[PDB]
Design a protein around this nucleic acid. Structure first.
Lengths: 96, 88, 92, 293, 232, 159, 58
RNA sequence: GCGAUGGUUCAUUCAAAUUUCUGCCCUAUCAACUUUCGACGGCUGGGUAUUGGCCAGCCGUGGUGACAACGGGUAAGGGUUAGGGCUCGGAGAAGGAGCCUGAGAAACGGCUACUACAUCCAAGGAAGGGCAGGCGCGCAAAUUACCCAAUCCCGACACGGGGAGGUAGUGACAAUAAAUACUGAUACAGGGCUCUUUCGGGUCUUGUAAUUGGAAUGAGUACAAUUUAAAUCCCUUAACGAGGAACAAUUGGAGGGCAAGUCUGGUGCCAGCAGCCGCGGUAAUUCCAGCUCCAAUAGCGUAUAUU
């Protein structure tokens, strides 16, 4: 995207919130809308229990995903100014 | 510049009101748009229990909030809860 | 408490005796330069009040301590020829 | 190329969610809480701040204290008492927070409780750590060690690189004037409050003046009866309803509005009086403490 | 208020006196041909430590320069000024060395009593009187009538009168006080006129090095006759 | 690579080092010395640059005790190594002089200020001890192995 | 996560890693480890196997 | 008699002003240029501190240029020589216009008028024109620190005054050194490890949440003295300061084990995804009791661009 390394976005809708199996990639993927350009791209939350911190209409930083749905390119790094792995590790509370 | 376009649409709505109820005092400014924010105001509350007036201390302040139409109904709230990190 | 004076200079126009002092406390803590002013009265046959000590950096590893000592001919010569901060540190 | 990369990173840093402002043209006074554990000197900072601003030595300042600090904006200081009901009542209310830490003693559970109550309820714009009781120290190496460790723990708590002021002594029973002058340099120039969803949808009010308007024949008949209460304050959220507004008086319960009188300000703040000079002449430094002395 | 490196290379300062250096006050000798009294007392001789100590020496009548009491601290004393300190009972004299720097010379009253000064110009002053201007800006009224330009004079320094003079001569040993061959005590053996500006002399040392220096930069010191004691 | 990992692990084990940063530090200064020796071998024999600069380098290494006093050629200066540098460290010198039982005991002693090199106590275990100063490694006077007070656990037990 | 007392100190971990990798080396090759003891030759103390050729065939 | 203050002239110093020859980078899609504020002289005066077309009257015919004038482009070094280093280097004080002081200014320090902002007032009047700091989204990151104590400067003058200078504070952006343990004895178990070739081969001392014993402390706490303008740091330094349940090492990656639990598939008992969730129980539980391995280790990972 763009010319930058990380993009910001709005979480439009957590697609695959009603998927059955817990660590499905359709369960982990989230449709976000990038601020700078306006397009809706899909991004992976790194973990299914870590999906619960991503709420609707939250400013979300996302980066590339460099390594079950092959081709979803982005991963959610920060949510509302706090790092998502820190939220998952219970280091910080999310400012809303 | 989708962010500034969205913020400009919000400011356009925030100009459309205060442009639309700037037309009459007794009808719009009093009855349509209520009692606008920032203005000092005196409230008369009827039916307060007398234990409040007997145990009124000036330290612990008074916060008046406005309930919505939905905030007076009762029912089963389904919530997403988690214990705190430092609660034993 | 062992004392040696190197580089003793007369300076009569400033009227004050200039000594590079190498003092040694082995095994003791530091030297307490007011007590060193008391010590530099009988070593050079003077009053304690007309001596001012400054410099006084302790060498590495204890023992040696290099100070600079000035003995004036009179306390009033000290008063008219000493800096304000050294006069305050001495106590006059 | 690297200039373009840094420009793109900052252009992505500037972005947020497009929320609604809901701030009027003549805005209400921004609410400054003075929160801390018991015995830390919140009332002392209140006395010192109101003497800095309006030059009035209050011997016992209670309630909200409204203060003109600029020609456009004004403040109001409320000291939270040491009860959790008041802390949870005012954490959803506060516009800027003055969060007090007790120096040599370190952090306290009331400070951490208010920090995470505020973060869970709604994070305001400006929270300033104020570290006091620094004069109860003997070694000024232990002093800077305590300042460093308290700064780093507060930075872990709220965000990295916050403002932590150090208020050293208590000279005239009040505070040092230079320390509270730079504290007021930081809390005087101001930016618009953060668009919180709860404050931008629901209309609230923090009562400046209380009065019991009840007939003494009713009080003589029934000593414990339903009374009528005049509560005077600034309307702060969205606008109240013109008739029949349902009210939650926090700590008492739900009632309905019997009357609203909309009347002019006691702190006029000269933009509203003139409706491009910098300084504030002493005509303008008003004090409206209708419960304090 | 010049820096320590912008101070000239012939009154020395070490890495010690701060980044700044005192400027000489206006007076008899020049700016770039100068030793101030503070550099002479506390930076060369080290009879003092600080500026305030140098002031406490100078303000009381303890330092006399060319036989008169000089009070101000940055008084210029460039060349051959006898500096009498009475509490130490010494008289210093300023000469140069072979490398091109200032040199101090301790001496007593017998050689301290006179000054060897080079004549700058002879003229007829007001009153129809001939007068004589040296390099110390000393003007002597009614001189000896052969003392022309570039001749040196033994000034009395207790009355200031003329006592003797040394003529500009091819065969009289001289001292260089300027130029790229600065400070080289040797004998004037040749002199070339170059009328139209900037004439020269050719001069050799005691041990056969010929070089050409300008007649402004020369300074006569004596034929053999070392009338001031150059340090042995 | 496994060769680099096994080599650095052999160094860190054989001389009681803390991490691989100390190994890379020694390898960097060894590569600097060896690069200077190769640049001096580039020139022909009996060039004055090679003569005086190689004599300076060889006298420096013999004086700091790395290079042996027997072999003094620039080819042996090229044949130098990191085992020789870590042998010239102080901590292995305490272990080899036998003031300590193991190399980790030696690092512990040098950290908590028991040995001294010459006159002053030495707080750092990577102190490059020279050949002239190798003999004067002993327990300090303020240490309970040297004298003075019987020490800490001794005081708590003898009370 | 919960980590080890060995992992909280980077020297002690590299001491125990070297002691166990010097131990794994004795199970592959043969270390010298002193010649005959003070007691003399008590036999080849752990077996002699006859049909085993352990020479690098050039 | 010795000085201080003052005075004419000549010096001298500190300056300032002009002034002589040489040296700018490129270009002819720049060959004519100057006389278009006189262009080159010489005479006479004016003004200047003085010379001078610098300016005014009179006349003469010039001056530069293909050896590169003129125009255009804007991208505005010298000295000290092993080296690097070190040293030196136009216009405005809201806008034009005019004036005042002094040795030195066309100070911008003041005045006057006009123009343009803007403040107090009792509505008659009256004073005034800089930088630094924060925000510059609603989301952020180096002190509003202390002193002239050294070096230096200005004055009736040893004392009075200095926004150069020095002192301190922050800092995982880097960079430097290296803590978080060292060492024994005894008891008990018989397996530990490896691989090409694997229901096979290779090698011989390894363990344990076992029981005990020794010492060694620097982080921190800290009396002092010292350092310093006053403090801090440093160096000295008396006294405390280690048994894990702590003085509490991290960041990543790979893998095993688990239920009277849950979900899904289907020619019974199988398989898969997985599993903080189980009958009870939260002052209840003591459990894989702290699971195993690999990498870096006070550092480490991810994304994108990539090379």
């Amino acid at each position: 995207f763009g010319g930058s390394s990380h993009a910001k976005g709005i979480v439009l809708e957590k697609v695959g919130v009603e998927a059955k199996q817990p660590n499905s990639a359709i369960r982990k993927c989230v449709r976000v809308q990038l601020i700078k350009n306006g397009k809706k791209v899909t991004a992976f939350v790194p973990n299914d229990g870590c999906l619960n911190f991503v709420d609707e209409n939250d400013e979300v930083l996302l980066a590339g995903f460099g390594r079950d749905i092959p081709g979803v390119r982005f991963k959610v790094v920060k949510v509302s100014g706090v790092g998502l792995l820190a939220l998952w590790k219970e280091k910080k509370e999310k400012p809303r | 510049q989708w962010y500034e376009m969205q913020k400009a649409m919000l400011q356009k709505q925030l100009d459309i009101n205060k442009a639309e109820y700037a037309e009459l005092d007794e009808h719009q400014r009093r009855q349509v748009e209520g009692y606008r924010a920032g203005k000092y105001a005196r409230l008369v509350i009827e039916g307060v229990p007398a234990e409040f007036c007997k145990n009124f201390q000036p330290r612990m302040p008074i916060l008046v909030g406005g309930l919505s139409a939905t905030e007076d109904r009762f029912g089963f709230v389904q919530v997403r809860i988690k214990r705190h990190r430092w609660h034993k | 408490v062992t004392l040696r004076t190197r580089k003793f200079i007369r300076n009569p126009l400033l009227s004050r005796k200039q000594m590079v002092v190498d003092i040694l406390h082995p095994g003791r803590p530091n030297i307490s330069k007011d007590e060193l002013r008391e010590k530099l009265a009988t070593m050079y046959k003077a009053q304690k009040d007309q001596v001012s000590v400054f410099g006084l950096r302790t060498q590495y590893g204890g023992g040696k301590t290099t100070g600079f000592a000035l003995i004036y001919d009179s306390p009033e010569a000290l008063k008219k020829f000493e800096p304000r901060y050294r006069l305050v540190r001495a106590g006059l | 190329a690297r200039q373009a990369a840094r420009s793109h990173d900052i252009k992505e840093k500037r972005l947020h969610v497009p929320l609604v402002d809901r701030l009027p043209d003549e805005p209400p006074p921004r609410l400054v809480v003075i929160v801390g554990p018991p015995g830390v000197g919140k009332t002392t900072l209140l006395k010192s701040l109101v003497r800095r601003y309006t030059k009035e030595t209050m011997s016992d300042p209670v309630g909200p204290i409204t203060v003109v600090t600029s020609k456009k904006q004004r403040l109001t200081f409320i000291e939270c008492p040491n009860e959790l009901e008041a802390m949870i009542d005012m954490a959803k209310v506060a516009d800027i927070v003055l969060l007090m830490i007790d120096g040599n003693y370190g952090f306290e559970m009331e400070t951490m409780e208010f920090l995470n109550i505020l973060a869970n309820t709604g994070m305001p714009g400006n929270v300033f750590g104020i570290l006091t009781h620094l004069d109860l120290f003997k070694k000024p190496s232990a002093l800077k060690d305590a300042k460093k460790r308290l700064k780093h723990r507060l930075w872990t708590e709220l965000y990295q690189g916050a403002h932590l002021f150090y208020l050293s002594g208590v000279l005239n029973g009040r505070y040092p004037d230079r320390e509270i002058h730079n504290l007021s340099r930081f809390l005087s120039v101001m930016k618009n409050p953060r668009p919180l969803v709860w404050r931008n949808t629901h209309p609230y009010t923090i009562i400046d003046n209380y009065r019991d308007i009840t007939h003494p024949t009713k009080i003589e008949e029934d000593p414990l009866c339903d009374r009528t209460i005049e509560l005077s304050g600034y309307l702060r959220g969205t606008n109240f309803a013109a008739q029949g507004q349902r009210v939650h008086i926090a700590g008492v319960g739900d009632f309905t509005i019997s009357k609203i009188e909309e009347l002019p300000d006691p702190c006029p703040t000269p933009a509203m009086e003139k409706a491009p000079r910098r300084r504030l002449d002493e005509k303008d430094k008003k004090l409206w403490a209708p419960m304090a002395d | 208020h010049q820096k320590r490196l912008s101070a000239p290379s012939h009154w020395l300062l070490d890495k010690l006196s701060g980044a700044y250096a005192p400027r000489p006050s206006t007076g008899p000798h020049k700016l770039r041909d100068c030793m101030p009294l503070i550099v002479f007392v506390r930076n060369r001789l080290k009879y003092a430590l600080n500026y305030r100590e140098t002031k406490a020496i100078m303000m009381q009548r303890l330092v006399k320069v060319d036989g008169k009491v000089r009070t101000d601290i940055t008084y210029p004393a460039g060349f051959m000024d006898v500096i009498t300190i009475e509490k130490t009972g010494e008289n210093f004299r300023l000469i140069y060395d072979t490398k091109g720097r200032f040199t101090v010379h301790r001496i007593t009253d017998e050689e301290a009593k006179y000054k060897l000064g080079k004549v700058k110009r002879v003229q007829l002053g007001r009153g129809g009187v001939p007068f004589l201007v040296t390099h110390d800006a000393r003007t002597i009224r009614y001189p000896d009538p052969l003392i022309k330009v570039n001749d040196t004079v033994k000034i009395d320094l207790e009355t200031g009168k003329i006592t003797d003079f040394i003529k500009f001569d091819t065969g009289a040993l001289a001292m260089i006080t300027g130029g790229r061959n600065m400070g080289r005590v040797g004998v004037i053996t040749h002199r070339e006129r170059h009328d139209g500006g900037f004439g020269i002399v050719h001069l050799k040392d005691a041990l056969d090095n010929t070089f050409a220096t300008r007649e402004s930069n020369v300074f006569v010191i004596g034929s053999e006759k070392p009338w001031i004691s150059l340090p042995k | 690579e496994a060769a680099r990992l096994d080599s650095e692990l052999k160094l860190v084990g054989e001389y009681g080092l803390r991490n691989k940063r100390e190994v890379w530090r020694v390898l960097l200064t060894l590569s600097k010395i060896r690069r200077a020796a190769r640049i001096l071998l580039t020139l022909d024999e009996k060039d004055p640059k090679r003569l005086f600069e190689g004599n300076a380098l060889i006298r420096r290494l013999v004086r700091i005790g790395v290079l042996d006093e027997s072999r003094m050629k620039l080819d042996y200066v090229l044949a130098l190594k990191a085992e020789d540098f870590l042998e010239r460290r102080l901590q292995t010198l305490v272990y080899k002089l036998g003031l300590a039982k193991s190399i980790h005991h030696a690092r512990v002693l040098i950290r908590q200020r028991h040995i001294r090199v010459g006159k002053q106590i030495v707080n750092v275990p990577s102190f490059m001890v020279r050949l002239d100063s190798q003999k004067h490694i002993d327990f300090a006077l303020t240490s309970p192995f040297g004298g003075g007070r019987p020490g800490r656990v001794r005081r708590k037990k003898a009370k | 996560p919960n980590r080890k007392k060995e992992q909280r100190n980077p020297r002690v971990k590299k001491r125990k890693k070297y002691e166990e990798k010097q131990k794994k080396l004795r199970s592959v090759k043969a270390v010298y480890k002193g010649g005959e003891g003070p007691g003399g030759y008590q036999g080849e103390l752990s077996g002699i196997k006859t049909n085993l050729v352990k020479s690098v065939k050039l």
